[PDB]
């Protein structure tokens, strides 16, 4: 049922990681009602009003040594440290795709239940690869550390014909292929 | 780039509601149960490969609260603008008849972190099997959320994911049938 | 296993 004016504050600390942990950036962020208002960015090394609402938070935070010294070490003591704790089950999580094919005249390659997001999926007709009119719903994040996507091929089959779906993913050293015949 | 671990907090003023959670490429590692004051890992295993002592995070929320009340005043009691979610719904795996499978309700791109979610097997609410993620951050600062309902697929049943938000004027129902 | 670390909220300045 009914209700009234809402007021919201967010604090997010983002650790961003390039090339292992060779380059690291911390982004500290405050949001009031969908308006970022002040931040700390380790590559800037001090707080900035993002808007005038945040102006006095910057001035005050910047006036404090330990706050500043802490954030400026965060890149090592907080980001790098937690990369280290999470690495083996996050950076190195491998869950292998499950594939199927079918018609819904159109064609479906369903790729599901897999993890990390990057994936490539190509369509094959007797061996020769098919570029034209691959429809691809794009990549979908399931909420539970597994992804899925669907790739369609618009082709009316003829009899004989062997359409094959190739799938490639860093959890399998070899490509996963799954064929269909009319 | 390559990776991103977000420590995400909110506190939501009148509802007196809060969250402390860790993100990794937009996947919850764990959150804290404010009621219970204990770590809740997103998947069991995480708890066997890391631990987490939660005392600091609990205080963080209290500070986020005090902080919110000051902003509320400084901002001249400017309230947030409701932003309706985009509710898609699709299945876990290839829905083959009479084989255990799961339905996902994606609640994306919405603000204030408040939603009633209800599933509807033929138009009759069902809460046996359900679980759900908590509120997940996004770059724009809106929120992501996920609800699951596991089931046996049939030729018979319609399902709807019924989400309620102050963006929408009426609950968004999204139909899933086995086509 | 090993402990995940946090960073603590900076308090905004008082009214």
């Amino acid at each position, epitope marked *: 049922g009914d209700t009234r004016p809402r007021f919201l504050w967010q604090l997010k600390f983002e650790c961003h990681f390039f090339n292992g942990t060779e380059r690291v950036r911390l982004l500290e962020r405050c949001i009031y009602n969908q308006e970022e208002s002040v931040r700390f960015d380790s590559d800037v090394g001090e707080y900035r009003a993002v808007t005038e609402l945040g102006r006095p938070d910057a001035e005050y935070w910047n006036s*404090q*040594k*330990d*706050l500043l*010294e*802490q954030r*400026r*070490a965060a890149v*090592d*003591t907080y980001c*790098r*440290h937690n990369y*280290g*704790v999470g690495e083996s089950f996050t950076v190195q999580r491998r869950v292998e795709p499950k594939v199927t094919v079918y018609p819904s005249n159109l064609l479906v390659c369903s790729v599901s239940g897999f993890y990390p997001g990057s994936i490539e999926v190509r369509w094959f007709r007797n061996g020769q690869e098919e570029k034209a009119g691959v429809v691809s719903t794009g990549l979908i994040q399931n909420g539970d550390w597994t992804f899925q996507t669907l790739v369609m091929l618009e082709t009316v089959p003829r009899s004989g014909e062997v359409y094959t779906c190739q799938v490639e993913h860093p959890s399998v050293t070899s490509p996963l292929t799954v064929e269909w015949r009319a | 780039e390559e990776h991103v671990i977000i420590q995400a907090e909110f506190y939501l003023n009148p509802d007196q509601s809060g969250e402390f959670m860790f993100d990794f490429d937009g996947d919850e590692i764990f959150h804290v149960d404010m009621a219970k004051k204990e770590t809740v890992w997103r998947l069991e295993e995480f708890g066997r490969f890391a631990s*987490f*002592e*939660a*005392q*600091g*995070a*609990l*205080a963080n929320i*209290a*500070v986020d609260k005090a902080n919110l009340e000051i902003m509320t005043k400084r901002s001249n009691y400017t309230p947030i603008t409701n932003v309706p979610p985009e509710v898609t719904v699709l299945t876990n795996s290839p829905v083959e008849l009479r084989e255990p499978n799961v339905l996902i309700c994606f609640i994306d791109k919405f603000t204030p972190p408040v939603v009633n979610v209800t599933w509807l097997r033929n138009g009759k609410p069902v809460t046996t099997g359900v679980s759900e993620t908590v509120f997940l951050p996004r770059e724009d600062h809106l929120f992501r959320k996920f609800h699951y309902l596991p089931f046996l697929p049939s030729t018979e049943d319609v399902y709807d994911c019924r989400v309620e938000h102050w963006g929408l004027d009426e609950p968004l129902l999204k139909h899933w049938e086995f086509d | 296993g*090993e*402990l*995940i*670390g*946090i960073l*603590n909220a*900076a*308090k905004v300045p008082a009214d």
Partner: T-cell receptor, first 110, second 108 residues
């Protein structure tokens, strides 16, 4: 002013009881009580991450503590046992530096 | 867990330099150094999470990514006598936590 704790000095009868005050004006949310036996390490008794939150240290027994306000962390000894003759120290910090009060030398007697 | 102070005792003639040392578990961080003078007052010397800070006769380096800090002391004075503790915070828990110390004696 940093951290200020009082009785710098107390004599406390066996079985009697007592409260050390510890007060800090720097807005620290994190505060802690330690005891230190002479020539020894600081051992943590109790600590508090903010208002209304507290947690047992490595030796919380025979002691008790409250935090209704950011500024104060009193520490209560209920039932003075002789094993509680020690030096007690209050500290606060938050983003960085640790600050210690001038200490409290408690001796418990028969 | 823990904080492991290198030398458990150190005795030097005034004017000498001192290196004190502290290694610490991946469970704690944000490393500080204190001086406990011999009337037991607990002085803070540095907050020193990472890198170098210097303060008159004292400087400290923390190699955050390797879990050790060095406290150096030029031209030590007899008054620097007492015990030195490296302290640190448990990650998440916010427990301030202490090595065993180093007794320092500076002889006139």
């Amino acid at each position: 002013a940093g951290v200020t704790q009082t009785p710098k000095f107390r004599i406390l009868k066996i079985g009697q009881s007592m409260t050390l005050q510890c007060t800090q004006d720097m807005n620290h949310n994190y505060m802690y009580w330690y005891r230190q036996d002479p020539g020894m390490g600081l051992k943590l008794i109790y600590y508090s991450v903010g208002a209304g939150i507290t947690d047992k240290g490595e030796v919380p027994n025979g002691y008790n503590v409250s935090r209704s306000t950011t500024e104060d962390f009193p520490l209560r000894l209920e039932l003075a046992a002789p094993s509680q003759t020690s030096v007690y120290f209050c500290a606060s910090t938050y983003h960085g530096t640790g600050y210690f009060g001038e200490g409290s030398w408690l001796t418990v007697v028969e | 867990i823990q904080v492991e102070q290198s030398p458990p005792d150190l005795i030097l003639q005034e004017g000498a330099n001192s290196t004190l040392r502290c290694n610490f578990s991946d469970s704690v961080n944000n490393l500080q150094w204190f001086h406990q003078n011999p009337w037991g007052q607990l002085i803070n010397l540095f907050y020193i999470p990472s890198g170098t800070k210097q303060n008159g006769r004292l400087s400290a380096t923390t190699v955050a990514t390797e879990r050790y800090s060095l406290l150096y002391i030029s031209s030590s004075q007899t008054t620097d006598s007492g015990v030195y503790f490296c302290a640190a915070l448990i990650q998440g828990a916010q427990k301030l936590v202490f090595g065993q110390g180093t007794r320092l004696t500076i002889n006139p």
